[PDB]
Structures are given as C-alpha cells and as structure tokens.
Amino acid sequence: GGIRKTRETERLRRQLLEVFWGQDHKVDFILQREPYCRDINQLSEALLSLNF
C-alpha cells in the first residue's frame, strides 16, 4: 500500500491519546468495519494491548 493507521491506533492505546482506534466509540470500531488498515488496528491493538 502506502500508509498505515497502526501507528496512530497503537500509540493512542499504548500511552498517547485515543486517535483512530481511540476516538471514543472508534476504539473497537477500526477492525469492526470493513477496511484492512482498521482491521489490524483493533485486531493487533485492542487484542494485544488489552490481553498482554
């Protein structure tokens, strides 16, 4: 591709502010939608950050 939302999504979730993955409702929203970029965000971020 070219650009990924992984950086904004995990950074929010890790220590920074709720950006993509974040934005209140958006937190889960990234993967639970349709695009691949968002899919990785909640998938990799919400699953790995919450569990581990």
Partner: protein
C-alpha cells in the same frame, strides 16, 4: 440524561445530551465521535423522521432511550 444511537453497521453509540437540545447539535456530537458530517446523517425514532428545527423533547425522549440513525451510503 444519556441515550444510545443505532448505526447501519449494527453498533450502539453512547452519548450524553439534554432533551432541550436540537437534533442538529446531537448530529454534530455524532460527527466528532464516528467521523461523518451531520447533513449526511438522519435520526429516526418510533417511526417518524426528526427535523433539524425540532428538539429531542418534541419526541418525549429521555435518558435511557435508544435512537436510530440512518443517512449516507457507501455502496449501491
């Protein structure tokens, strides 16, 4: 008073607004939460359409009611 909105994807959004506020203001709150303009988002309750010139109180909505939202299309 807090209320939950229903999206076309099957997701209930959680927002906090007063019954004396206008439907258009609630639409703005939605835009900042999901990322979609208000003019492309409609709000339906009971079976009637809510106008931007009317308020939530006009539809006797209170903290705990579930409001429906249906506007903007991605496919065809």
């Amino acid at each position: 008073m807090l209320i939950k909105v229903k999206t076309l994807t099957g997701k209930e959004i959680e927002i906090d607004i007063e019954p004396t506020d206008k439907v258009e203001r609630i639409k703005e709150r939605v835009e900042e939460k999901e990322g979609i303009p208000p003019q492309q988002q409609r709000l339906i309750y009971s079976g009637k359409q809510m106008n931007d010139e009317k308020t939530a109180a006009d539809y006797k909505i209170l903290g705990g009611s579930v409001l429906h939202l249906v506007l903007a299309l991605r496919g065809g």
